[PDB]
Amino acid sequence: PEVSNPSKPGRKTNQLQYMQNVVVKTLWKHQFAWPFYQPVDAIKLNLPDYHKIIKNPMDMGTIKKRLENNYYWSASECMQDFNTMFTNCYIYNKPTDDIVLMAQALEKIFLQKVAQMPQEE
């Protein structure tokens, strides 16, 4: 989707800096992260049912650019986008698919880092 929205409030916070410089950075370096770097390409991957099932696509490249563009008002909003990305993967793919295991390992790290996020100040 959009990396900026003229009608949506956005700002800088120390927590959003943490999302950018700790959470995004830590997940990007993981070997399981590459399926999430860019929007799902239903044509290249021949997934003619992907956009029939997933209505609100999300990916880590979009989250990263949103952080750089001050799209978010709060860290919780950026966390919600991470959640949309992982939840889409669980909703669409087969329960036994490799990508589901990849999503699970990344989401565990996501939640661990969120648990350590500095208090908003």
């Binding site: 399981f32 399926p35 991957l45 997934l47 669409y92 793919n93 698919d97 490799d98 990508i99 990849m102």
Partner: peptide, 9 residues
């Protein structure tokens, strides 16, 4: 559902 195939995990 079609799904994305193996990713060598």
């Amino acid at each position: 559902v079609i799904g994305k195939g193996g990713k060598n995990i």
